[PDB]
Amino acid sequence: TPLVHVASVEKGRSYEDFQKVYNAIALKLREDDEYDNYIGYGPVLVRLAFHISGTWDKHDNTGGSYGGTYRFKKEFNDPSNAGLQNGFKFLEPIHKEFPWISSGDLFSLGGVTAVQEMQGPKIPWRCGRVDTPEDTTPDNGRLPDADKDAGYVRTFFQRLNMNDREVVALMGAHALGKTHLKNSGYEGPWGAANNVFTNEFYLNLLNEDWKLEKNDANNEQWDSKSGYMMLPTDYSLIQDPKYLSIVKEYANDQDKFFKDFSKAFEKLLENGITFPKDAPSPFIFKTLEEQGL
Ligand code: HEM
């Protein structure tokens, strides 16, 4: 009925092979630090990992990270994906260097690398994604809109099998990077340390004095006097009672948040994939720092 996407390890590669891809990405993150006014490419990679995974549909098993379909024009030119071409271009040279890795594996590894190199938690990762044909490319319109409420969010996430806790954990990724008017019709960062992974998102949500205003693209956003912004969907996390109690917990305990994020992120990246019993267990990569590089 539903497609079956069985993970198949890149022939003859082991842990050491993947750690090398990881190190290459990480070294290039360290090196191209001027991107986006010195934010670096971390945030854009994280966003890319979400976008390639978020097209999944638990009803017929289409979309998700397995097929590396973002590589095709249709998905590539998805209006919801505007701005991601920057993460793509960042990874190309890496792919050229390690041509045996599948796309889905590369896109998803980039997210993991980014998180860990920005001092986030360790995210166990699995290889085995296999490139699929251009016709397995999902139609545009499966990614979420920003101008909605908590109801919308819950519903949307349900399509990916995520519960409340998972939604809130994943959203703390909004501590990174910022919105760009030309990309999404929104402008401004969510906080101050936008290239270090922390629970800042939750603190800003609870602690700032947010004002609803229209931006230059004529969209509504929540603006704070500190110069931060929140999308309607971010703001909805404090409008929903179930969401709000989790926001508070995270605001209160970065460690808890890191644990929840880690699990949720890996789940997101593995949705739609079947891992045979002989498949290697998830790898945990060392950072540059841990290797002394
Ligand atoms: C309701 C769900 C979500 C909505 C509506 C949403 C919407 C957006 C929008 C409109 C942008 C700005 C794009 C631009 O102008 O460059 C953005 C950026 C971003 N998104 Fe989300 N997002 C959602 C969930 C997530 C999740 C689950 C993650 C990862 C766990 C994520 C990671 C990011 C990151 C890191 C950025 C900043 C990228 C940069 O600085 O280039 N988002 N998101």
Swiss-Prot record:
Subcellular location: Mitochondrion matrix; Mitochondrion intermembrane space
Major localization class: mitochondrion
Positions of modified residues (Phosphotyrosine): 152
Record carries keyword Secreted: no
Active site: 51, 190
Site label Transition state stabilizer, positions: 47
Phenotype when changing residue 190 to F: Substantially diminished activity
Assembly with partners or alone: Forms a one-to-one complex with cytochrome c.
Protein name per its UniProtKB record: Cytochrome c peroxidase, mitochondrial
Classification of source organism: Eukaryota, Fungi, Dikarya, Ascomycota, Saccharomycotina
Residues of the full protein shown: 69 to 361 of 361
